[PDB]
Amino acid sequence: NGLTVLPPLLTDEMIAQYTSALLAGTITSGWTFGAGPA
Amino acid sequence: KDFGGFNFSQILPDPSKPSKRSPIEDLLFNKVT
Amino acid sequence: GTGVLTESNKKFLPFQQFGRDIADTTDAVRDPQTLEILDITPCSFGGVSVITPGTNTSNQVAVLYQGVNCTEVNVFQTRAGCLIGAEHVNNSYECDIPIGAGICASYQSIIAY
Amino acid sequence: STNLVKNKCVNFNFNGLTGTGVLTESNKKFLPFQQFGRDIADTTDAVRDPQTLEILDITPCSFGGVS
Amino acid sequence: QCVNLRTRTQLPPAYTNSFTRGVYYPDKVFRSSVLHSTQDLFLPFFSNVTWFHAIHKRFDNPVLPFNDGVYFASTEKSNIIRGWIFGTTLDSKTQSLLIVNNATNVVIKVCEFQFCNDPFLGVYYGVYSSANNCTFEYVSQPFLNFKNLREFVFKNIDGYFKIYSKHTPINLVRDLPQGFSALEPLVDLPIGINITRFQTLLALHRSGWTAGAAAYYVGYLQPRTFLLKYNENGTITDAVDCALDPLSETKCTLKSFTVEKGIYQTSNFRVQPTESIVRFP
Amino acid sequence: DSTECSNLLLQYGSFCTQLNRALTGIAVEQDKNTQEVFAQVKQIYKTPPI
Amino acid sequence: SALGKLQNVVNQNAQALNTLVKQLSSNFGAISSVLNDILSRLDPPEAEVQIDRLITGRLQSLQTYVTQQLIRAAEIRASANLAATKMSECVLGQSKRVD
Amino acid sequence: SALGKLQNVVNQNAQALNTLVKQLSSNFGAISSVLNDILSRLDPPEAEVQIDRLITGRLQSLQTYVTQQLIRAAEIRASANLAATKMSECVLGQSKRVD
Ligand SMILES: *[C@@H]1O[C@H](CO)[C@@H](O[C@@H]2O[C@H](CO)[C@@H](O)[C@H](O)[C@H]2NC(C)=O)[C@H](O)[C@H]1NC(C)=O
Ligand SMILES: *[C@@H]1O[C@H](CO)[C@@H](O[C@@H]2O[C@H](CO)[C@@H](O)[C@H](O)[C@H]2NC(C)=O)[C@H](O)[C@H]1NC(C)=O
Ligand SMILES: *[C@@H]1O[C@H](CO)[C@@H](O)[C@H](O)[C@H]1NC(C)=O
Ligand SMILES: *[C@@H]1O[C@H](CO)[C@@H](O)[C@H](O)[C@H]1NC(C)=O
Ligand SMILES: *[C@@H]1O[C@H](CO)[C@@H](O)[C@H](O)[C@H]1NC(C)=O
Ligand SMILES: *[C@@H]1O[C@H](CO)[C@@H](O)[C@H](O)[C@H]1NC(C)=O
Ligand SMILES: *[C@@H]1O[C@H](CO)[C@@H](O)[C@H](O)[C@H]1NC(C)=O
């Protein structure tokens, strides 16, 4: 009836990849990666 | 303006301008229409 | 009504004639002459979006039909919909113009990636 | 067709178009066929006098809050 | 007086591109520095416009259906084209409109003319045989390598026949020039009669007869929306056809002639019902 | 698909444009929210194999 | 009930969509809620009035739905800003802020 | 596009005001959008109906505009509270909060 659902720009695998990158940075580099180079 | 080599001319107010604004502030007011 | 009639796998009881979904819209109907069940899918409707760079750079455009398969309208099928006028490349770049479902568009002709 | 007054808030009736506004002299150079004038918001802010071929701006009558 | 012309050479009419011509002022409202969207009878951009020639032996005077509106383009020198004929049956049974410009003055008449099969004017170096019931007369100012471009738009809405005109100095030899020129409304005519067919009037040159070099173009109007641009002086300088291409549709939707980089929602696509099915017991 | 209903609906003006614009703003806002929350690093770091 | 906050947001959005679709079934004081029935059963002078009643009821429903969607969008935006703040201060650094 | 955030606020406010003035030109199902035309062309028994239609349409438009302004005002208030927090914690002191 005219209703459409737009897909999200970030898919679930890409969001999971972002979380994986954050986890890898915080495990291997601590807080250094958040303020500059890892 | 003796600040040990630090220059703040771009953020301090300009005496030459009637609005008494900084060059950055003047740029910001110019860039908004 | 208006719709697309497809073969149905439903098991209508003999009294039952037309089927309604959760939202009380008629999603299945029985033909009164030959007792077979047909699904009624709503006709394809979607938004038409124009992907373009600045007019200073170029006048080329691409069109996105949201939620519409490519066979009911440089043709590329995305989850967001059918994209006409942009070539799909296998290389990955940063997002310039967001299309959706992980797909973005850029100008280099207009490419989608 | 009565006399035309300017710089006052009056009820204007130009060729069947009525309203209330201050009629002032205009600097808009109209084309010979055009009679009315509109702004961005589709409101008539300029008019051409039928008796004398001149252009007048209609500024709306003064209004504001009283605090 | 009527004369049959029997020295024509058979040739099909040509076709060419309209480009961005056929634009006129939709109303009598002055607008300054604004963009205005109008839904009127307009000629589409880059449309297929019919091309007719007058050259020597070609003498193109067919009778064309009026449709909802007519765009007439004239690449003219020496003023061969003098006027037009409008009506339904072009005889005394119905009432017809006649527009002529002879050597002295412009005459507009609404009469029941007994028209010739081949009506024309003549200059030495005959339009109708009778006019019985004349209901309206109007005398006006003179309207008039190819040197002159004369653009006219004729509309018949609510019993009012609108004539829009524009004169452009041109120097193109054969086809239409590419550019923009807004047509100012020239004559608002109160006729209140039915018009479905028209025919233009040419002028012969006598020294049999010779046809002067002229070319005209016929286009038809369709109901559509244009986005018009008004400058600081209130003159229309640019227009956008909202239904021509998706880029102009985006320009029409955003109400701007410049579109920034990005994705913009412009329309809704609905699959139209191809057939109607009835199923009864 | 009613033409008469749409013709009557046109008398009320740009309500439909306002509603579509608001929904579009919400839809882009959700993507902006997801970018703000998750896309805070521009390097995709990976763990060592051991 | 560990994941109640997300389920609440999903349920609210689905319920709003269901209510908006359900509002089409209401006639809003007209003889029928179906446009085709009104167009096929009545002359245009009274069918215009019935369609007008349907249009105003549906438009009121749609405006109401958009209004709660905007309010929920504001709430989700505030929650997302808080989540971004937690991601910046708790994950990408060590925070001295209590609780 | 450096100052896009302020420009979006200015554009939204101007667009809302422009749409609000444009809503006056809609008749909302009446014969005309001009009150003076209705007063001059019709008797008061039908004029009351026509002004009733215009009043309800314009009132709905104004209520919609006020609701949108309230939501935007809430968003700007949240942004201003964030800006005040940044002014207190980043300019008037050194902050240990990451990002
Ligand atoms: C601080 O910076 C300002 C601007 O960056 C300097 O002013 C410049 O001075 C040079 C030579 O003295 C001139 O050629 C430039 O035109 C000046 N720029 C402007 C914008 O005025 C200033 O000299 C620096 N130092 C101090 C101590 O103020
Ligand atoms: C020029 O030719 C046309 C076409 O043949 C002539 O028109 C015919 O006139 C006769 C008059 O008796 C009619 O009966 C025919 O029906 C007409 N034909 C058409 C197609 O309308 C016209 O009369 C000729 N001109 C002259 C001066 O004779
Ligand atoms: C114009 O129409 C003629 C036939 O009417 C056709 O042959 C020609 O190709 C058309 N031109 C264009 C540009 O479509
Ligand atoms: C106008 O004339 C055409 C044919 O000459 C006819 O079909 C049509 O019905 C007429 N219209 C009116 C309003 O008389
Ligand atoms: C032009 O036509 C008008 C009316 O038909 C007539 O009065 C006038 O004399 C004509 N001009 C010439 C030069 O014959
Ligand atoms: C039109 O002309 C014919 C013949 O001259 C005449 O019989 C008829 O009455 C006229 N009609 C009108 C309305 O004058
Ligand atoms: C507008 O008119 C002025 C003179 O009144 C002229 O200088 C200017 O060029 C005109 N603008 C355009 C776009 O033609």
Author numbering:
A (entry chain B): 856 to 893
B (entry chain A): 795 to 827
C (entry chain A): 548 to 620, 641 to 675, 691 to 695
D (entry chain C): 530 to 596
E (entry chain A): 14 to 69, 77 to 145, 158 to 176, 185 to 247, 257 to 330
F (entry chain B): 745 to 794
G (entry chain B), H (entry chain A): 943 to 1041
Text taken from the publication that reported this structure:
Therefore, the combination of enhanced electrostatic complementarity afforded by the L452R and T478K Delta variant substitutions likely accounts for the moderate increase in ACE2 affinity. Analysis of the electrostatic surface potential of the ACE2-bound Delta variant S protein is consistent with enhancements in electrostatic complementarity afforded by both the L452R and T478K mutations. However, this moderate (~2-fold) increase in ACE2 binding does not rationalize the dominance of the Delta variant over other variants with higher fold-changes in ACE2 affinities (Alpha, Beta, Gamma).
The Delta and Kappa variants of SARS-CoV-2 co-emerged in India in late 2020, with the Delta variant underlying the resurgence of COVID-19, even in countries with high vaccination rates. Herein, we report cryo-electron microscopy (cryo-EM) structures of Delta and Kappa variant S protein trimers – both in the unbound state and in complex with the ACE2 receptor – to gain insight into how their mutations underlie changes in ACE2 binding and antibody neutralisation escape.
